[PDB]
A paper describes a structure:
Ankyrins are a widely expressed scaffold protein family, which mainly function to link great varieties of functionally related but structurally diverse integral membrane proteins to the spectrin-based cytoskeletons. Each ankyrin contains an N-terminal membrane binding domain (MBD), which is composed of 24 ANK repeats and responsible for binding to diverse membrane targets. We identified three distinct autoinhibitory segments from the intrinsically disordered linker and CT regions of AnkB, and elucidated the inhibition mechanism of these segments by detailed biochemical and structural investigations.
We anticipate that this stretch of negatively charged residues is part of AI-c and involved in binding to MBD (likely R16-17 based on the length of the segment). In the AI-c folded-back structure, residues from AI-c form extensive hydrogen bonds with the residues in finger loops of ANK repeats. Perturbations of these hydrogen bonding interactions (e.g. the Asn834Lys substitution in AI-c or the Asn595Ala mutation in one of the ANK repeats finger loop) led to a few fold decreases in their bindings. Hydrophobic interactions also contribute to the AI-c autoinhibition. Met839 is buried in the hydrophobic pocket formed by Leu668 and Leu701; Leu843 interacts with sidechains of Leu597, Tyr630, and Ile635.
Residue numbers in the entry: 430 to 844
Amino acid sequence: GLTPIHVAAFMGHLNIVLLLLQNGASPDVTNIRGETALHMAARAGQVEVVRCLLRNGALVDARAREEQTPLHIASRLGKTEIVQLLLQHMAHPDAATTNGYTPLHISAREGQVDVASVLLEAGAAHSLATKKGFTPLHVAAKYGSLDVAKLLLQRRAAADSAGKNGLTPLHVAAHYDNQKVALLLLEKGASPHATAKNGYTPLHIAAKKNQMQIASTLLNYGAETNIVTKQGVTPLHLASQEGHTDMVTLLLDKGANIHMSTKSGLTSLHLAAQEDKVNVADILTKHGADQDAHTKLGYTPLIVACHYGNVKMVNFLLKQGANVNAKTKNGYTPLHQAAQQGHTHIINVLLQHGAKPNATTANGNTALAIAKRLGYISVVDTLKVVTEEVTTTTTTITEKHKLNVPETMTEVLDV
């Protein structure tokens, strides 16, 4: 709901602004958004109008929607000369919007390095946190504002400030793949060891995203390879699950322990088995991974690969000597797991490698019986030739097929 001074100011009609003020118009009337003529002059870049309104007594820090001052607006649009004028008229450099963004946060988000330089020289606090804990350095790390991040760190902004979930700017830069900012933070002294609330380090993130240069530099600054999240996950687990062979090799080269398992018993080799990462599995095997490590429920990598139907991983694990007749704690063999999931092609490989078709689970079922109850006619037709007949009765104990699945790793970085 505009008044005449709002219109004149937005349009930059300096003659009309003076005419209105000369006749007693108040510079502080607001429109429906709570904006004054100064908000609108700033948004439109009207440097001379801004100077005239300030010199004629306008409220410098009038608050509009989201508690925005004219300084927030000028900073967002990179109106350096208007930022300077507002600060010279006592605009508070640390004024915060309702979400906690200061003009410095805004300049880091928009990559306005000239505005950030003016704010920092005028005394803006360089490390105030938003509601979620983000400092301007966190924002620069999320939006890849390298030149603003350089300025912040030159003014000794805190490189290790941690948000609500414990994320440091280095976490944020790695997560958002802003690799120059990550490398700058480390060179300027950011800790390579910082842990989020769930235990993620920057090395975990680098390992998961195959950020080879970041991982190398972290390791050069002393980062540990054998640290765990709250679920027991290591950087090597993450690299292995994703198939990042060069990352797996780098972490092993730098001391990673190939035998570490998660909370539920998953080793790196289980995760390669889950994701069919045969080249990873080869490297892990050459570094001594136990081909028959068991999860908490008793899944070996081979039974895991049978569950997910990963025949290349099945063939690879069999050639390394994995036990084709291994049993989970409730008696599932590779054959039972493949039967339950309908994987006829895996059934045929397992039978060729000596899987025992009459093996029974703890409840007494063969693989044939499990596939039969679940309607995998192709599996039944294959196992029929090689399995002893059993009669199914209504009293037959059947398996809990939804429970009889391998453990999985679902933990992720908390952003």
